[PDB]
């Protein structure tokens, strides 16, 4: 069980840790989050009480180093930093724990929600989508644009999701225009799975990371990426059976976790209606169709 200590909390802020969140008051003696499950990526996220604009946060994995949060009064945000001195860090955490100034990662033993949302997500893949190679953790916020959004403007602060474009030479083989447009199996299986992602695990990891950035930061380009990766599978007649079964489980936990009040902005009517009712895979997503029909029947 790992710990992310905080130097202090000088500004009032809502703090997120994965799917959980806590309000901290201005100068409240808050010194961090303990009992964080080893074996998963995590995200620690912020929304200032005085500017609810710019949700921002840090993807990290406690196996990769000792991370802490410290407020920067110049840049006006909570920053993640790595502590390279192991003994200094152990001594800081032990003190804050002894003084019980840390919130406990509030995991219910029965509850596989975080594992289910992050099953294929790997820190090394996050660090290639979010490029800042001097840090082992990755900063994301509400406003960061994707490589695809930029093409259609600061490259260093972009989300480098894999570009998916149904009306592109990459998606359409010369001489198979109608076949490749109506059945995206060659784009899914040859170009994306064999060509770019190498395997379905990397494809699902990116899909899962896009959804979590959409949900936790209201990142609009992430939401576009999540829907494009769903639509590419649903619009393919030929998908490995294990991939369809796994996609149904992934989407089920995503729809289950989504705040009921955000369905209006986080879910694309056209994509979901097409995926569940018109697509090749209309009958392949039993769990997802049942939760969507019971939780969001308006959308459909």
């Amino acid at each position: 069980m790992n710990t992310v200590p905080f130097t202090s909390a000088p500004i009032e802020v809502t703090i997120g840790i994965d799917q959980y969140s806590f309000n901290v008051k201005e100068n409240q003696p808050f010194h961090g989050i303990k009992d964080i499950p080893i074996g998963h990526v995590h995200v620690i996220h912020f929304q200032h009480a005085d500017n609810s604009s710019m949700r921002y946060g840090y993807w990290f994995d406690c196996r990769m180093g000792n991370f802490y949060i410290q407020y920067d009064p110049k840049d006006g945000l909570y920053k993640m930093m790595e502590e390279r001195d192991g003994a200094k860090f152990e001594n800081i955490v032990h003190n804050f724990k002894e003084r019980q100034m840390m919130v406990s990662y509030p995991k219910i033993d029965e509850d596989d929600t975080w594992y289910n949302l992050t099953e294929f997500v790997q820190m090394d893949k996050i660090r290639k989508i979010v490029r800042k190679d001097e840090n082992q953790f990755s900063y994301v916020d509400s406003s960061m644009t994707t490589v695809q959004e930029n093409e259609l403007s600061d490259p260093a602060h972009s989300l480098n999701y894999t570009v998916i474009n149904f009306k592109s030479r990459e998606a359409i083989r010369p001489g198979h225009e109608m076949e490749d447009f109506l059945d995206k199996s060659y784009y899914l299986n040859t170009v994306m799975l064999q060509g770019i992602f190498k395997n379905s695990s990397n494809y699902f990891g990116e899909l899962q990371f896009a959804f979590l950035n959409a949900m936790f930061f209201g990142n609009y380009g992430s939401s576009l990426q999540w829907h494009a990766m769903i639509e590419l599978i649903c619009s393919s007649a030929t998908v490995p059976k294990h991939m369809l079964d796994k996609l149904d489980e992934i989407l089920y936990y995503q729809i289950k976790t989504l705040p009921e009040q955000y369905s209006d902005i986080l879910l694309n009517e056209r994509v979901w209606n097409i995926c569940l009712y018109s697509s090749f895979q209309k009958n392949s997503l039993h769990n997802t169709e049942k939760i969507m029909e019971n939780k969001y029947p308006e959308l459909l």
């Binding site: 009306k167 592109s168 030479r169 225009e177 109608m178 447009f181």
Partner: protein, 237 residues
């Protein structure tokens, strides 16, 4: 974006453009089977590809053999149209290739956009105009070359005959759309108006009769009257 009444003069500027109408590509007769079910029999069709500035018509004849053993023909017809327009563009020298293609039906946008990915600088546009190009097969000489075809064929026409010697492209397009609108609304009556006087003939190298400027005014009047009458009937007004 979309071509409408507001940007109408753009049709007659010096940027090469083509209209594409796919409404006569897939044509059928519906009939009863021996067992009393219904079946279709395809007949020859055509792509209507027109330069509105010059009157040059690229009439690609669609022979019934292209449907043999295919499924979902109304869908395939849009893709086959897009394939043939793309092939026509690649066959033209660069300086003759259009800068825009306007499709008369929005269902042609994705098929044509996907077939033209190699031409990112050619804009594919819809139109809000309700153009009567479906009535092309009411022009006897176009109907005749389509029905007689025994294989895929491209035939080139000037749909304005020699009108551009005397009138502007704008006026020639206005005349063509009025003729086609009349032929579409009441073909028999339209055809009677065009041929009633036996002294005015169609030249071997022309589609329409050799009307004087004064005779075209009378004809154009007779076509507008046909259209309004028919409209008062259609709607009881």
């Amino acid at each position: 974006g979309a071509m409408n009444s507001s940007n109408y003069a753009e049709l007659f500027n010096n940027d090469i453009k083509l209209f594409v109408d796919d409404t006569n590509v897939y044509r059928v007769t519906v009939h009863k089977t021996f067992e009393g079910n219904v079946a279709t029999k395809a007949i020859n069709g055509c792509i209507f590809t027109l330069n509105p500035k010059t009157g040059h018509l690229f009439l690609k004849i669609i022979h019934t053999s292209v449907w043999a053993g295919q499924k979902r023909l109304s869908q395939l017809a849009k893709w086959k149209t897009a394939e043939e327009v793309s092939a026509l563009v690649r066959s033209l020298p660069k300086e003759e290739q259009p800068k825009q293609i306007i499709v008369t039906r929005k269902a042609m946008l994705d098929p044509l956009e996907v077939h033209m990915l190699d031409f990112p600088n050619i804009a594919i546009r819809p139109t809000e105009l309700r153009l009567p190009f479906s009535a092309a097969m009411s022009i006897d000489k176009l109907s005749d070359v389509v029905m007689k075809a025994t294989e895929p064929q491209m035939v080139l026409f000037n749909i304005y005959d020699d009108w551009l010697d005397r009138i502007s492209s704008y006026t020639a397009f206005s005349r063509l759309t009025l003729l086609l609108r009349a032929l579409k609304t009441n073909e028999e009556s339209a055809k009677m108006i065009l041929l009633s006087d036996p002294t005015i003939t169609i030249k071997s190298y022309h589609l329409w009769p050799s009307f004087t400027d004064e005779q075209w005014i009378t004809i154009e009047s007779q076509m507008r009257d046909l259209i309004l009458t028919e409209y008062g009937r259609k709607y009881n007004v």
